[PDB]
């Protein structure tokens, strides 16, 4: 992605909280193909640090079973994009999020192929409106989708 | 699906040979989920009868091997609505075609709640024009698809 498809001055600590994943869509189908896709994760909470990194608490299915992870991803020199510093490196890139309703972003494997990117329309509460369906609808118009999920 | 929203004079002996199944999308995501999920079979070949009826060669995962199926779409009272008559029952619902590019259809399982339906872009040969997955994304705005895969 470039630099200027991410979210120009995010505070990392206004995003603090609940979130609830609404939707996914991915570069690549078998990034997001069975519930055991490595990037088939539903977001929980965003914790930021004081030190500006950012904790991500996932749910995963995992056996049958719906675990929990908790994942750093670390500040980088490019404000909205983070660093999850694993032996397998991923990085975490915010589209745009108005704080108080929805949040965008994406997952980026670079150490693979191509561009094997996942991104997921985030929204802070159930209710019953598709502003930020809508603005991930055109988010994702720039890029080459090849999955793309819905929930309910 | 209601009487007017699929194919008009259809004839079906013209749809006959090699298909290829472009693209995918469902009322429900456990539809196409994984690789086994049911509806989710991958379209070779068309072959009406001479009685009018409709013979489908499929490629569906199963175990970790390609397996082919056979199944017959018998006709109905109403033009470009098939049934498979099997013990869970099944309409193939022919929504457009130019018999010469691209071929749209859905399946639907009227035996389960709502509305489970799941519909496919076909098209007779690889070649690289979008004017198939244009024509999908339009017959399926009136739809609420949760899950849209795309093939390479």
């Not at 991803?73 to 510093?85: L, R, Y």
């Given at each position: 992605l470039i630099v200027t498809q991410t979210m120009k001055g995010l505070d990392i600590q206004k995003v603090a909280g609940t979130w609830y994943?609404?939707?996914?869509?991915?570069?690549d189908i078998s990034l997001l193909d069975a519930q055991s896709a490595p990037l088939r994760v539903y977001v929980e909470e965003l914790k930021p640090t004081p030190e500006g990194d950012l904790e991500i608490l996932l749910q995963k299915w995992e056996n049958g079973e719906c675990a929990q992870k908790?994942?750093?991803?670390?500040?980088?020199?490019?404000?909205?994009?983070?660093?999850?510093?694993?032996?397998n490196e991923n990085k975490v890139l915010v589209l745009d999020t108005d704080y108080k309703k929805y949040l965008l972003f994406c997952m980026e494997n670079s150490a693979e192929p191509e561009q094997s990117l996942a991104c997921q329309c985030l929204v802070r509460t159930p209710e019953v409106d598709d502003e930020a369906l809508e603005k991930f609808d055109k988010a994702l118009k720039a890029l080459p989708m090849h999955?793309?999920?819905?929930?309910?």
């Open positions: 994943s609404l939707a996914m869509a991915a570069s908790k994942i750093i991803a670390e500040k980088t020199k490019i404000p909205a994009v983070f660093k999850i510093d694993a032996l999955i793309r999920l819905s929930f309910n």
